[PDB]
């Protein structure tokens, strides 16, 4: 295990978010830093066997990823117990919490204004870039949502939470019909109907993330139950535009919610569309502009 870290090197400092995720200190985990502030994901004591398997699969999946716009795995403590999954600390947490913090009357308002158009475009491009990388690696995410995007110290947004991520190298799709605890308000109609997941169904969720950004993470299809959303979306229903939502973002959103998955854009197309409206560091860090995007 090239990913193995000595347990004595990890110190837990506080709880970040409920398996408990912790903020920790890790000594000698990153070259050139004697000690690094990290996030540490662990498994509940009462986690079912399915949950324990999925947690280990999630950690394993992360080992293959290297992208500025994807949350970095730093190491694994797997000798003895319990298993610690060590990753890049995202100083501003998840995008859903962050966005809700930016509401005018939010108790925890950080005293910074809500996102500008440029900032929303930057977020979009970063999320789409991370997803383009994921897709090129032949994985489908399956749970793309603001709550699973993370915000760095410099407000860079990165894809996280790979709990539902599946390898699609052989066929370009993952199919799982049946009953599950599922992110219904984020799911494509063909996923709901046929149980099929593809990069195009991740694109539907991307549309919902855009909607989250411009609504400051309102709940999608508010007033509708889970079972009504299921019916509504399968029947060709989609979300209405948020108040004062910029037209350019609306246009994108609608393209993401084409009923026919074949008609939705790809993640490379999203980045390409936005590429001239981004911070100058973007081509230095993006998968899009990288030699790997071949």
């Amino acid at each position: 295990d090239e990913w193995e870290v000595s347990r004595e090197k990890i110190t837990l400092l506080r709880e970040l978010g409920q398996g408990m995720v912790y903020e920790g200190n890790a000594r000698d985990i990153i070259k050139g830093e004697a000690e690094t502030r990290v996030a540490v994901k662990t498994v509940n004591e009462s986690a079912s066997l399915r949950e324990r398997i999925e947690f280990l699969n999630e950690a394993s999946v992360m080992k293959g990823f290297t992208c500025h716009h994807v949350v970095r795995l730093l190491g694994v403590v797997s000798k003895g117990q319990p298993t610690l999954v060590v990753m890049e600390l995202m100083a501003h947490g998840d995008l859903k919490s962050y966005l809700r913090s930016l509401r005018p009357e939010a108790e925890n308002n950080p005293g910074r204004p809500p996102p500008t158009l440029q900032e929303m475009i930057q977020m979009a491009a970063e999320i789409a870039d991370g997803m383009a990388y994921l897709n090129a690696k032949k994985f489908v995410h399956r749970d793309l949502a603001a709550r699973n995007c993370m915000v760095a110290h410099d407000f860079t947004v990165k894809i996280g939470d790979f709990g539902m991520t599946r390898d699609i190298y052989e066929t370009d799709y993952y199919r799982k019909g049946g009953k599950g605890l599922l992110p219904v308000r984020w799911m494509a109609p063909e996923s709901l109907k046929d149980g099929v997941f593809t990069t195009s169904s991740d694109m539907w969720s991307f549309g919902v993330v855009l909607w989250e950004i411009t609504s400051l993470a309102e709940q999608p299809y508010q007033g509708l139950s889970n079972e009504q959303v299921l019916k509504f979306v399968m029947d060709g229903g989609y979300l209405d535009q948020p108040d004062n939502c910029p037209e350019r973002v609306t246009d994108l959103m609608r393209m993401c919610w084409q009923f026919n998955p074949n008609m939705r854009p790809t993640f490379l197309e999203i980045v390409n569309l936005l590429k001239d409206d981004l911070h100058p560091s973007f081509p230095e860090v993006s998968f899009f502009h990288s030699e790997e995007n071949k």
Partner: peptide, 12 residues
């Protein structure tokens, strides 16, 4: 967290 962001439904 956001447990309300998931519900028990059937797909497929």
């Amino acid at each position: 967290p956001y447990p309300e962001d998931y519900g028990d439904i059937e797909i497929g």
